[PDB]
Design a protein around this motif. Structure first.
Motif, mmCIF file in Angstrom:
data_model
loop_
_atom_site.group_PDB
_atom_site.id
_atom_site.type_symbol
_atom_site.label_atom_id
_atom_site.label_comp_id
_atom_site.label_asym_id
_atom_site.label_seq_id
_atom_site.Cartn_x
_atom_site.Cartn_y
_atom_site.Cartn_z
ATOM 1 N N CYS A 91 0.796 -1.236 0.000
ATOM 2 C CA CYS A 91 0.000 0.000 0.000
ATOM 3 C C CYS A 91 0.831 1.291 0.000
ATOM 4 C CB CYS A 91 -1.013 0.003 1.141
ATOM 5 S SG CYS A 91 -1.913 -1.566 1.246
ATOM 6 N N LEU A 92 2.149 1.151 0.131
ATOM 7 C CA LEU A 92 3.053 2.294 -0.021
ATOM 8 C C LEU A 92 2.877 2.958 -1.392
ATOM 9 C CD1 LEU A 92 5.438 3.943 1.183
ATOM 10 C CD2 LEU A 92 6.927 2.435 -0.144
ATOM 11 N N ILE A 93 2.810 2.147 -2.436
ATOM 12 C CA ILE A 93 2.847 2.642 -3.800
ATOM 13 C C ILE A 93 1.442 2.643 -4.433
ATOM 14 C CG2 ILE A 93 3.824 2.336 -6.116
ATOM 15 C CD1 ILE A 93 5.879 3.199 -4.005
ATOM 16 N N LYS A 94 1.104 3.737 -5.107
ATOM 17 C CA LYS A 94 -0.170 3.853 -5.817
ATOM 18 C C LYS A 94 0.114 3.982 -7.324
ATOM 19 C CE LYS A 94 -2.557 4.030 -1.938
ATOM 20 N NZ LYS A 94 -2.042 3.491 -0.635
ATOM 21 N N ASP A 95 -0.869 3.663 -8.165
ATOM 22 C CA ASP A 95 -0.606 3.599 -9.600
ATOM 23 C C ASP A 95 -0.437 5.012 -10.170
ATOM 24 O OD1 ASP A 95 -3.111 4.500 -11.243
ATOM 25 O OD2 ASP A 95 -3.872 3.353 -9.542
ATOM 26 N N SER A 96 0.202 5.101 -11.331
ATOM 27 C CA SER A 96 0.646 6.387 -11.867
ATOM 28 C C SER A 96 -0.493 7.320 -12.264
ATOM 29 C CB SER A 96 1.559 6.173 -13.069
ATOM 30 O OG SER A 96 0.854 5.494 -14.083
ATOM 31 N N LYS A 97 -1.736 6.853 -12.120
ATOM 32 C CA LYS A 97 -2.907 7.671 -12.446
ATOM 33 C C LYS A 97 -3.774 7.896 -11.214
ATOM 34 C CE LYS A 97 -2.787 8.604 -16.894
ATOM 35 N NZ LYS A 97 -1.908 7.568 -17.498
ATOM 36 N N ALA A 98 -3.270 7.493 -10.049
ATOM 37 C CA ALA A 98 -4.069 7.572 -8.836
ATOM 38 C C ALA A 98 -4.330 9.016 -8.475
ATOM 39 C CB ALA A 98 -3.369 6.857 -7.690
ATOM 40 N N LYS A 99 -5.493 9.281 -7.893
ATOM 41 C CA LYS A 99 -5.887 10.655 -7.601
ATOM 42 C C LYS A 99 -5.446 11.048 -6.206
ATOM 43 C CE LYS A 99 -10.048 11.117 -10.442
ATOM 44 N NZ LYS A 99 -9.181 10.742 -11.592
ATOM 45 N N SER A 100 -5.181 10.046 -5.371
ATOM 46 C CA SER A 100 -4.811 10.294 -3.982
ATOM 47 C C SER A 100 -3.942 9.159 -3.450
ATOM 48 C CB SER A 100 -6.051 10.447 -3.101
ATOM 49 O OG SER A 100 -6.507 9.182 -2.647
ATOM 50 N N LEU A 101 -3.411 9.351 -2.252
ATOM 51 C CA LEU A 101 -2.603 8.328 -1.589
ATOM 52 C C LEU A 101 -3.451 7.373 -0.753
ATOM 53 C CD1 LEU A 101 0.374 10.584 -0.564
ATOM 54 C CD2 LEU A 101 0.450 8.665 -2.215
ATOM 55 N N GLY A 102 -4.769 7.448 -0.920
ATOM 56 C CA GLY A 102 -5.682 6.533 -0.233
ATOM 57 C C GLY A 102 -5.778 6.841 1.243
ATOM 58 N N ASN A 103 -5.729 5.803 2.078
ATOM 59 C CA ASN A 103 -5.874 5.995 3.530
ATOM 60 C C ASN A 103 -4.607 6.552 4.175
ATOM 61 O OD1 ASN A 103 -6.573 5.835 6.322
ATOM 62 N ND2 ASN A 103 -5.875 3.700 6.421
ATOM 63 N N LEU A 104 -4.703 7.775 4.682
ATOM 64 C CA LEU A 104 -3.560 8.455 5.280
ATOM 65 C C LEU A 104 -3.662 8.545 6.805
ATOM 66 C CD1 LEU A 104 -3.127 11.197 2.537
ATOM 67 C CD2 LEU A 104 -1.487 9.359 3.089
ATOM 68 N N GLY A 105 -4.627 7.841 7.391
ATOM 69 C CA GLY A 105 -4.864 7.950 8.834
ATOM 70 C C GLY A 105 -3.671 7.485 9.658
ATOM 71 N N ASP A 106 -2.887 6.567 9.087
ATOM 72 C CA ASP A 106 -1.732 6.005 9.787
ATOM 73 C C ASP A 106 -0.406 6.432 9.147
ATOM 74 O OD1 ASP A 106 -3.427 4.823 11.617
ATOM 75 O OD2 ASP A 106 -3.393 2.837 10.685
ATOM 76 N N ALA A 107 -0.486 7.358 8.189
ATOM 77 C CA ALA A 107 0.641 7.691 7.334
ATOM 78 C C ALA A 107 1.653 8.605 8.027
ATOM 79 C CB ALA A 107 0.154 8.331 6.042
ATOM 80 N N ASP A 108 2.898 8.563 7.557
ATOM 81 C CA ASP A 108 3.930 9.505 7.978
ATOM 82 C C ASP A 108 4.185 10.507 6.854
ATOM 83 O OD1 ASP A 108 6.473 10.793 8.371
ATOM 84 O OD2 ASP A 108 7.158 9.169 9.649
ATOM 85 N N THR A 109 3.554 11.673 6.955
ATOM 86 C CA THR A 109 3.451 12.579 5.817
ATOM 87 C C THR A 109 4.807 13.251 5.527
ATOM 88 O OG1 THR A 109 2.728 14.453 7.190
ATOM 89 C CG2 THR A 109 1.018 13.032 6.363
ATOM 90 N N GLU A 110 5.684 13.296 6.529
ATOM 91 C CA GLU A 110 7.012 13.867 6.334
ATOM 92 C C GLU A 110 7.937 12.942 5.526
ATOM 93 O OE1 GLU A 110 8.237 16.853 6.909
ATOM 94 O OE2 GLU A 110 10.352 16.442 6.482
#
Ligand SMILES: CC1=C(S[C@@H]2CN[C@H](C(=O)N(C)C)C2)C(C(=O)O)=N[C@H]1[C@H](C(=O)O)[C@@H](C)O
Ligand SMILES: [Zn+2]
Ligand SMILES: [Zn+2]
Length: 231
Positions: A167-186
């Motif tokens: 789930c780290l990587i999203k496809d080259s046409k993705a509109k968003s990074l999906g679920n960011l609730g647990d993400a490290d945005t830095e």
């Protein structure tokens, strides 16, 4: 190239690699796809990621038993969320040895996951400590740093052009990074770039929530992540 088996979809990527896809059904959500991998390593099978549920994961095992009919030597799961670790009890009921990031196992109780039997640890350069990943055959396991979650790990398949971003990587046409609730945005963008650097010859990038893509998936993910960091 997709084939339906029960409620799962399988797609052959290489002579010895298949993508498994399962779809979540709670009442309340769309039919959300999640992808993992099956790797035939000669006389045994290696699994990367469970399905959403135990039942779905048991279906994956039945597909393996029918279509390959070799013993599943191990499964590695790439972080502690349901779509990757939801089927741990099915793996354990089948007597399959399971491996995850030590941090995934530590997070598991908080996330509602069953922990893997064995814990992977990593060097400072991100490569799995090979003492903790015995007999992984062609699976090259790399911790790229925190991104989608703190514990996310990635896997290259030696002998092939395939690397798995999870789930780290999203496809080259993705509109968003999906679920960011647990993400490290830095650190997300740097972790996406590190994954690209760890597997610099991979030309097929497999990820959890879209079809296999080119390396453009990696650069598009890192851009979206840097955009997020700068807001
Ligand atoms: C929820 C799931 C998501 S968000 C999701 C998947 N693609 C979606 C979407 O909205 N598209 C338009 C493609 C929604 C992700 C993710 O974005 O990585 N995975 C799962 C959750 C997660 O992995 O964080 C589950 C495992 O909790
Ligand atoms: Zn996740
Ligand atoms: Zn996911």
């Amino acid at each position: 190239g997709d084939q339906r088996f029960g409620d799962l979809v399988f797609r052959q990527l290489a002579p010895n690699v298949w993508q498994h896809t399962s779809y979540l059904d709670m009442p309340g959500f769309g039919a959300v796809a999640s992808n993992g991998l099956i790797v035939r390593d000669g006389g045994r099978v290696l699994v990367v990621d469970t399905a959403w549920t135990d039942d779905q994961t048991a279906q994956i095992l039945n597909w393996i038993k029918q279509e390959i009919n070799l013993p599943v030597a191990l499964a590695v799961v790439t972080h502690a969320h349901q779509d990757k670790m939801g089927g741990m009890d099915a793996l354990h009921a089948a007597g399959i040895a399971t491996y995850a990031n030590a941090l995934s196992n530590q997070l598991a109780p908080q996330e509602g996951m069953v922990a893997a039997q064995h814990s992977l640890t990593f060097a400072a350069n991100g490569w799995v400590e090979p003492a903790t990943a015995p007999n992984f055959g062609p699976l090259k396991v790399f911790y790229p740093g925190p991104g989608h979650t703190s514990d996310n790990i990635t896997v290259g398949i030696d002998g092939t052009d395939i690397a798995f971003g999870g789930c780290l990587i999203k496809d080259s046409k993705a509109k968003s990074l999906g679920n960011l609730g647990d993400a490290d945005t830095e650190h997300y963008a740097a972790s996406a770039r590190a994954f690209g650097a760890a597997f610099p010859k991979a030309s097929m990038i497999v990820m959890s929530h879209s079809a296999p893509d080119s390396r453009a998936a990696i650069t598009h993910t890192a851009r979206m992540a840097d955009k997020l960091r700068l807001v």
